[PDB]
Design a binder for this molecule. Structure first.
Ligand code: MG
Ligand code: MG
Ligand code: MG
Ligand code: MG
Ligand code: MG
Ligand code: MG
Ligand code: MG
Ligand code: MG
Ligand code: MG
Ligand code: MG
Ligand code: MG
Ligand code: MG
Ligand code: MG
Ligand code: MG
Ligand code: MG
Ligand code: MG
Ligand code: ZN
Lengths: 129, 132, 221, 83, 217, 71, 25, 101
RNA sequence: UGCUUAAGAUUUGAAACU
RNA sequence: GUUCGAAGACGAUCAGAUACCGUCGUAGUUCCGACCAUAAACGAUGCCGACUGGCGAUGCGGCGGCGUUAUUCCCAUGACCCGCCGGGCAGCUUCCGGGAAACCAAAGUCUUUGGGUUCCGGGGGGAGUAUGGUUGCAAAGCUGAAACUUAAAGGAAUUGACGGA
RNA sequence: CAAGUCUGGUGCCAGCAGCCGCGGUAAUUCCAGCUCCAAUAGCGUAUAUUAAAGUUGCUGCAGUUAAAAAGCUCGUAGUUGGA
């Protein structure tokens, strides 16, 4: 069964691109996933989504544009200091121009370019480009 | 086995296509003509060519041919193309129209028509194919 | 010698009307004639024949050898081309494979590695590419790094001007037929790959088959 | 594609699709540019100006060309809103 | 193809649709073609929408009219039924048609006889005209097809849902597209009716032609 | 790998620590009785005393008698 | 040998080697 | 390599069926592997029914038939020329052979 | 409408762009 | 303890047959009771989890429906017919996608590499052998090396010659 | 893997060769001359070893047919556990 919902959603958002869809539905509503989608929205990879509320694990309907190559998820979760984040973006992204490793810290969920601002590191959740 | 070769088949046609009016039906007439409409070196090839030519002018006078273009018959085919009946075959009086096409006709612009002789819907649902 | 063209594109090239090869790669028109490319690029158009490969089959009397040929062609800035063709001997075959190499050239794309001063020299992202069981991965490089590769595609990347690039391979690289097509497919994907600078939507220009339809009719069929 | 001083250094901007938003290469010999003519609203003749559309190949061989044409024309003001 | 009162569907074209039978579909619905069909009958015949017939017919004559040269619009048919039809639509416009037995390689191989480079394909039926819908994917070509409610959309580009079995529907749908492309380029008035008959475009049995020779005189 | 947890180290290392023993160059060189049964004993030269001169045939396409010395 | 007759001859050799540890045990 | 998708038989969801003997040989074939012909046949072919129907007592006595359900193995079913091997591309057609001659 | 029909010494082949 | 029938005797066939062919035939084949735990035990494809195209079928439970069919006195139960839904063995068709290829709605979502989690392989032979333990009345089974020896052994498709096909 | 179809001898003999391969009466590969090459006061031959090896694989391997998933379920430790 489902040990990671965020890890069955970024694959359910991976299999709609290689087909060429427009809008898709995900079954559980995590607060992590919600802070994740509102990370990808600030960079404008996707459109504006919405959440559906029953009194359960709510649902989400995402609108998709055409700039989203591959959204991923790391398992398991690690700890990444400031001298490891270089050796992750060395060999987990295409180039140094774009792509966004995303990681939670004690300050909140943010990308690595921001983690350099705030001089902070913490546990990793995934990557998207 | 007397089977005529392709070198014969290819020369019977261009001669027909260019001298269709001049050719006839007797063998010894077009047997003399192909000597002076064509550079044929020998005699045996002469009599073989005209021998298959007088087999096509018989097949043509019996019907048309696939791979040869007849201009006299192109005129009759052109008129067979251009044949138009006088009275129209569409602007009739009675159009049998089912009530479910009446429905979407209601959802169209033309809500009422003139001569829609509506018919009965077929009771019993049997259109499929038995399995063996 | 005075090549007479057959097609609409050969007629439009004979009258010096289309000015470059960018309006063919902008439209993906099929290039079906060899003398266009020589008409544009006879200057810096070089050749490096890779390998002669004597394959053969069997009949009821001896065996029958027909030689296959690999030719890599291209300048050092902008375009590359490959050609493979087999015949009874090398004189005919090399001549008949330089043809298909001129008939199958593609544009390369190039970016930077981080800093953006000077001129573009490196591959914009990490690409891959494969044929058979050969998997070639191309990696971007910092300035002055040099070509880090095999002696075979160091020759083919040289014929694209890309000076600084790490490479990698996987599989049975001894087959030069495959390993060349793999390093050709890896560099034929670079204009099919989205970069978030390519976001500004395309303005649709007019077709050239539509821009020049008046003059073609009083010059040909 | 500007290095440090805004110089456009690539040799051509490629095309870009209109349905699935994934761009069309040079070797893609299964790509369409449609041309649909505008019409005046009182007579029904040809004005002279075009609406143009591009479609990449894998969608086309998949079989969804018309649903994109039908949506791009419905959104662009050709076909009435009932349909 | 709409948002206008002028270009609407007139009654004499409606009664000549219900007359010939371009509403009577096939039997097996295709999943790409759900949006044009109203309601399956008993006897299991699907009911088409004339509005979504006319919106596609007008979009086909828009694309064709916008094309400037009339002399590179090819039109292919192979069934025995619409040979006469695709030869008089091409007489009314000036198309360069192909009437049966499409020789392969004629779009891609230069040294053949009629090596042609067109810009638009129109096809009577895709099942039996499955060759050129493949030779449309090596040269960049749009495609129009006279689709039924049953045929697929492999490599087709705009579809016009019709009937394509009887001896009446193809000659009509070619005649109506002849009128609308002439009511589109300024050649023919729109208000007046077309002079000659859309019964020109039918198929005649080699029997019925031999039957109308005896009692004619 | 097949297990990917955060605290699965004694499973990984006690799986690699077994499956190394099925290598051939690790087992011959490292612990085992090959250094025991080397006639030199893990060295590069050895002196000897001749006792006889014999010859040995050669194998296939070839046909000769090579020369060997029992030591 | 196929494989079954090889497997059979091994068992006809082991029923001989345990026997040929006679007088010796 | 693997040559047919089902392995010549119909064992899809059981794991075991029972064996059935042939007729010419005695080779044991499981049931859904066998080639089951069904032979109905008159006791007179064509020309002796004229000489039965004349020498009978009753008025056109209808003759009986002889209903036999056969089986065959593989190498009898081929050595007696009922089935013939086919090309790979014309294996898949599993319609029965026609009934004209 | 089917009977039998064992065997055959060791060695010996390779292609370049102008 | 019917029928078949390892071992065995016998009659032919064959150069020779201790083999196939044919007559007889013990041990066994069947039943209850104690054991042994091995098979191409094969879909030669570990188990849970979803996800991403369709098209006809077939089987249980359920949801409606024109209409025939019997019960006749009809709602309701039975039999066909047209649809919907769950999961269960399957099938055609396809440029999703992959793969060395045959081929697969999974052997797919993999250099754009990470959903969780069990067992196991590291060239071929020597060899599933030696020894050491251990369960078993026996036959045998589970764990299970080396010494030496060799540059090929092997899988998928292509052409040719060949077949008492 | 840079560089002799040079000349004279043996004729599956004697021998070279890490690997493919050479030698049976004209050997570019053998013993010798001539010539030619690469490193240069240094160079080869053994052995131990690291990289190449994503052929020990945490980054980064395989398990239908090539080596490969226990015959089948249950099950305590362990490992991982929805909102
Ligand atoms: Mg791993
Ligand atoms: Mg096999
Ligand atoms: Mg079984
Ligand atoms: Mg017995
Ligand atoms: Mg015997
Ligand atoms: Mg027993
Ligand atoms: Mg027992
Ligand atoms: Mg198990
Ligand atoms: Mg081994
Ligand atoms: Mg082998
Ligand atoms: Mg050397
Ligand atoms: Mg080592
Ligand atoms: Mg391996
Ligand atoms: Mg195996
Ligand atoms: Mg097994
Ligand atoms: Mg087992
Ligand atoms: Zn049998």
């Amino acid at each position: 069964v489902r040990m990671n919902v965020l890890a069955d959603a970024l694959k359910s958002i991976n299999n709609a691109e290689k087909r060429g869809k427009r809008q898709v539905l995900i079954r559980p509503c995590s607060k992590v996933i919600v802070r994740f989608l509102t990370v990808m929205m600030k960079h404008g990879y996707i459109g504006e989504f919405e959440i559906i509320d029953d009194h359960r694990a709510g649902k989400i309907v995402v609108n998709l544009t055409g700039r989203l190559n591959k959204c991923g998820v790391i398992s398991p979760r690690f700890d990444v200091q400031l001298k490891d984040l270089e050796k992750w973006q060395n060999n987990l992204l295409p180039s140094r121009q774009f792509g966004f490793i995303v990681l939670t810290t004690s300050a909140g969920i943010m990308d690595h370019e921001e983690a350099r601002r705030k001089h902070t590191g913490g546990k990793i959740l995934g990557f998207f480009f | 086995g007397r089977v005529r070769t392709k070198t014969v088949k290819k020369a019977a046609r261009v001669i027909i296509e260019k001298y269709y009016t001049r050719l006839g039906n007797d063998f010894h007439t077009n047997k003399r003509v192909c000597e002076e409409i064509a550079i044929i070196p020998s005699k045996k090839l002469r009599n073989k060519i005209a021998g298959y030519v007088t087999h096509l002018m018989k097949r043509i006078q019996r019907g048309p041919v696939r791979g040869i273009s007849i201009k006299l018959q192109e005129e009759e085919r052109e008129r067979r193309d251009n044949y138009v009946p006088e009275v129209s075959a569409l602007d009739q009086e009675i159009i049998e129209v089912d009530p479910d096409t009446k429905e979407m006709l209601k959802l169209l612009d033309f809500g009422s028509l003139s001569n829609l002789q509506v018919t009965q819907p077929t009771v019993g649902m049997n259109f499929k194919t038995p399995r063996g | 010698k005075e090549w007479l063209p057959v097609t609409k594109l050969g007629r439009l090239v004979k009258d010096m009307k289309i000015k470059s090869l960018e309006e063919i790669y902008l439209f993906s028109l099929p290039i079906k004639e060899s003398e266009i490319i020589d008409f544009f690029l006879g200057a810096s158009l070089k050749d490096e024949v890779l390998k002669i490969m004597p394959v053969q089959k069997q009949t009821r009397a001896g065996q029958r050898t027909r030689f296959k040929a690999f030719v890599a062609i291209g300048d050092y800035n902008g375009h590359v081309g490959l050609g493979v063709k087999c015949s009874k001997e090398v004189a005919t075959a090399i001549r008949g494979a330089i043809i298909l190499a001129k008939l199958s050239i593609v544009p390369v794309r190039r970016g930077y590695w981080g800093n953006k001063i000077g001129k573009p020299h490196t591959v914009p992202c990490k690409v891959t590419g494969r044929c058979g069981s050969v998997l070639v991965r191309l990696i971007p490089a910092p300035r002055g790094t040099g070509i880090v590769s095999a002696p075979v595609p160091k020759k083919l990347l040289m014929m694209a001007g890309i000076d600084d690039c790490y490479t990698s391979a996987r599989g049975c690289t001894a087959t030069l037929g495959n390993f060349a097509k793999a390093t050709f497919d890896a560099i034929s994907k670079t204009y099919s790959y989205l970069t978030p600078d390519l976001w500004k939507e395309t303005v649709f220009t007019k077709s050239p088959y539509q821009e020049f339809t008046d003059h073609l009719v009083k010059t040909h069929t | 594609m500007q290095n440090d001083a805004g110089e456009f250094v690539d040799l051509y901007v490629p095309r870009k699709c209109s349905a699935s938003n994934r761009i069309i290469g040079a070797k893609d010999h299964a790509s369409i540019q449609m041309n649909v003519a505008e019409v005046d609203k009182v007579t029904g003749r040809f004005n002279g100006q075009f609406k143009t559309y591009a479609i990449c190949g894998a969608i086309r061989r998949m079989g969804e060309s018309d649903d994109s044409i039908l949506r791009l024309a419905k959104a662009d003001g050709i076909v009435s809103k009932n349909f | 193809s709409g948002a206008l009162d002028v270009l609407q569907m007139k009654e004499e074209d409606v009664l000549k649709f219900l007359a010939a039978g371009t509403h009577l579909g096939g039997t097996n619905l295709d999943f790409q073609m759900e949006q044009y069909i109203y309601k399956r009958k008993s006897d299991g015949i699907y009911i088409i929408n004339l509005k979504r017939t006319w919106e596609k017919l007008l979009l086909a004559a828009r694309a064709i009219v916008a094309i400037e040269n009339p002399a590179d619009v090819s039109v292919i048919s192979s069934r025995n039924t619409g040979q006469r039809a695709v030869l008089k639509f091409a007489a009314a416009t000036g198309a360069t048609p192909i009437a049966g037995r499409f020789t392969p390689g004629t779009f891609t191989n230069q040294i053949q006889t009629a090596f042609r480079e067109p810009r638009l394909l129109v096809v009577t039926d895709p099942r039996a005209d499955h060759q050129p819908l493949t030779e449309a994917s090596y040269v960049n070509l749009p495609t129009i097809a006279l689709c039924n409610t049953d045929s697929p959309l492999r490599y087709v580009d705009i579809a016009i849902p019709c009937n394509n079995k009887g001896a009446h529907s193809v000659g009509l749908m070619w005649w109506m597209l002849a009128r609308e492309v002439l009511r589109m380029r300024g050649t023919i008035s729109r208000e007046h009716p077309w002079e000659v008959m859309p019964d020109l475009y039918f198929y005649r049995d080699p029997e019925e032609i031999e039957k109308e020779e005896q009692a004619a005189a | 790998g097949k297990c990917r947890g955060l605290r699965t180290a004694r499973k990984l290392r006690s799986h690699r620590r077994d499956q190394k023993w099925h290598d051939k160059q690790y087992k011959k060189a490292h612990l085992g009785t090959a250094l025991k049964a080397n006639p030199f004993g893990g060295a590069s030269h050895a002196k000897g005393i001749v006792l006889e001169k014999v010859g040995v045939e050669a194998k296939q396409p070839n046909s000769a008698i090579r020369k060997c010395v029992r030591v | 040998m196929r494989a079954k007759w090889r497997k059979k001859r091994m068992r006809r050799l082991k029923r001989k080697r345990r026997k040929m540890r006679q007088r010796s045990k | 390599t693997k040559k047919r998708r089902n392995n010549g038989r119909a064992k899809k969801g059981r794991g075991h069926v029972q064996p059935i003997r042939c007729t010419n040989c005695a080779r044991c074939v499981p049931k859904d592997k066998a080639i089951k012909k069904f032979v109905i046949r008159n006791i007179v072919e064509a020309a002796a029914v004229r000489d039965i129907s004349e020498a009978s007592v009753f008025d056109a006595y209808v003759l009986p038939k002889l209903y036999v359900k056969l089986h065959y193995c593989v190498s009898c079913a081929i050595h007696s020329k009922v089935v013939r091997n086919r090309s790979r591309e014309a294996r898949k057609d599993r319609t029965p052979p026609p009934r004209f001659r």
